[PDB]
Each structure stands twice: as structure tokens, then as C-alpha cells.
């Protein structure tokens, strides 16, 4: 068989010391069992900020500095924050044109829901920061 399967997360199977399971050195982790070398903790500096500090079992988790929002999977790239009611596009960030909105500091502007198409009234008209909330369907 192969006894490195026995080694839990937080340790590695040391091929120099006859497959004993020693814990992970400083600034290092192993997220699964069986690993022959521990992995280096990601360090969050500059554009990023440490959210969850790294353990022996788990990597570090990086936020983005205030005014910025994590772009990719795992907060890899880092994009800037427009305010509510705006959309950052090409050439900077601009307010949403009338009839559009954005409820977050992220993303594009979507057009308002059109209530008239389901026979519905408009209970509260939309702004640039919130959508129209539609009234009761005329099937009631």
C-alpha cells in the first residue's frame, strides 16, 4: 500500500524522514490529506487585504481594499467600486441613464422592469438605485 494517505490536512508526508506526517512549516498549509509538500500561504498585500488569515489546514483569504471589489474567482483580480446608481464602463464610471438602475457598487446597469407587460401596476417607481416594484397581477 501507500501510507501517505494516512497524513491529514495540516501535515505533509516527508519523503526525507520515511513518510512520517510532520506539520506544515511557517507561512504554509495543506488543505487535503496525502500531500508530499505543503503549499505556501498566499499573502495579501497592497491592492488586497487579509480577510481570513491562513492556518495549517487552510489558505489565506484576501479581500480588496476599501473602494474596490473582488473581481475574479477567489478574489484574484481587483476592480473599483462605483456608487449605487452608477456603472463603471469604458473610460471611468458614469451614472445610469434614466430608466436604468444598479443596486450594487459593482456591475452594469439593467433596465427597469416593465410592469405593464404582465398587466401590473407600478407600486413604487424605480430610481437609478432600485428597480420598479410591480403591483398585483390582474389574475386575482
Amino acid at each position, epitope marked *: 500500500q*501507500d501510507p*501517505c494517505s494516512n*497524513c*491529514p490536512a495540516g501535515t505533509f508526508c516527508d519523503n526525507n524522514r*520515511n*513518510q512520517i506526517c510532520s506539520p506544515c512549516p511557517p507561512n504554509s498549509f495543506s488543505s487535503a490529506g496525502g500531500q508530499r509538500t505543503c503549499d505556501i500561504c498566499r499573502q495579501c498585500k497592497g491592492v488586497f487585504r487579509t480577510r481570513k488569515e491562513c492556518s495549517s489546514t487552510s489558505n489565506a483569504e484576501c479581500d480588496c481594499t476599501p473602494g474596490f471589489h473582488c473581481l475574479g474567482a477567489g478574489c484574484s483580480m481587483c476592480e473599483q467600486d462605483c456608487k449605487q446608481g452608477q456603472e463603471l464602463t469604458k473610460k471611468g464610471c458614469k451614472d445610469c441613464c434614466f430608466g436604468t438602475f444598479n443596486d450594487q457598487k459593482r456591475g452594469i446597469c439593467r433596465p427597469w422592469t416593465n410592469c405593464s407587460l404582465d398587466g401590473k401596476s407600478v407600486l413604487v417607481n424605480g430610481t437609478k438605485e432600485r428597480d420598479v416594484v410591480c403591483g398585483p397581477s390582474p389574475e386575482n
Partner: antibody
Amino acid sequence: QVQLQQWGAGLLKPSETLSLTCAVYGGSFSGYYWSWIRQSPEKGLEWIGEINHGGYVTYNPSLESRVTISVDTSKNQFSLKLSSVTAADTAVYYCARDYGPGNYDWYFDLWGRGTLVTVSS
Amino acid sequence: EIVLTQSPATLSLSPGERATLSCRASQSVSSYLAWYQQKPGQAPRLLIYDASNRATGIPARFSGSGSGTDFTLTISSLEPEDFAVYYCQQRSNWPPALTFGGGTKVEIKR
């Protein structure tokens, strides 16, 4: 046709230091782990520790505080040093080569002849 | 540590009979267990490794079995050379441990 010869002091007073040496004849030294094992009539067979060509060591925890195992790769020799001995450390000390069939070297396939060490005031 | 306990302490059998020795681990050791024979004044000699495989010079009458916490060494038919002390040995990496049993003396029944 590999074989191990061991030698060293066999009679020590308490507080002194046990020192022993094993020499490998007729094979390579690098591919293996080399162990020291002692046998007591009181405490039986007890593994002390192991070393390889790279000087990487594992020790039995019950002994780590007074054990040292070292290697001389120029003579294919490893050696054991046990400090602050006591009557309890009287035993036959063996050197041995670890063996395993797989990715582990977890048994003992080849043994020295043993060196009896007595400690007494 | 993990402790291996052999039983019986000693075994008295007449030549040609069948010897069955036992080893019990205090927690599981999977199959990472070996048997050694030791004749008086000699070093121990490896017989069985990985619970059930003979080492190079070992004859056919030696046989091992077991996995987990209960292992048996079987000598199918005892011969004069086979009356000695038999030790079991285990190794573990989690938790790290290397230990032997207390031994079973196999003695000539008279």
C-alpha cells in the same frame, strides 16, 4: 552480500555517555534508512531512531532528549550517542537497515550482531 | 504510543505440531506489521512483513495473516530450528509510532 559491523564502549558509569558506531560493508549507503534498536530484559525491544545519507533523523520520542544519531558518509558509518546514562540503559544495542516493499521503509531486514552495553557504579 | 500485546506469553508444543501465535494492537495499524524470530544470542530475523508476506530467506511453513488490530503468525509444522522467541512489530505515521511486542517463547513440549 551486505553486512554490518558495530563497535564501541561496553561498560560505563552513570551520567556518562553511551557511544557506538556501525559500519556498512559491501553495498551502497544512500538508498536506505539506518536504525538503532536496543533490547533489554526489562523493557524488551525498543527502536531508538533512524538516519539516512542526508542526515535526516527521526528519534523515538521517549529518548529524543538524550539521543543523537549522526552519519559519516565518507566511511559509510553511522553512530549513536546517548547522554546521561543510567542503569536502565543497560541493553544489547543493534544497528539495522530499514526495509519495505512499497513507498515506505518500515521494517528491519538486516541486523548487526549486537553490542552489549552495561552501566554500573 | 501504540502498544502491541502478544499472547500467550509462552507456547509449549511438540515438534511437528502447528504453532499459532497472536498479536493485538491497541489501535489499528492497518497491515504495517512484521514478525521476527530471535534465537538465543542472535539478532532478530525478519520473517513476515506487511502482515502476510514472507521475507527472502524464509521457508514455506511460515505464514502470517491479519489486518487492523488482530494478527496471527502460523508455523504449519514445527521443526527443531523453529523453537525460539517471536516478536511482532508495527509502524505508524499518524500518529508517529514504532513499537515491538513483548515476545512469545515457543518451547519444546516434553
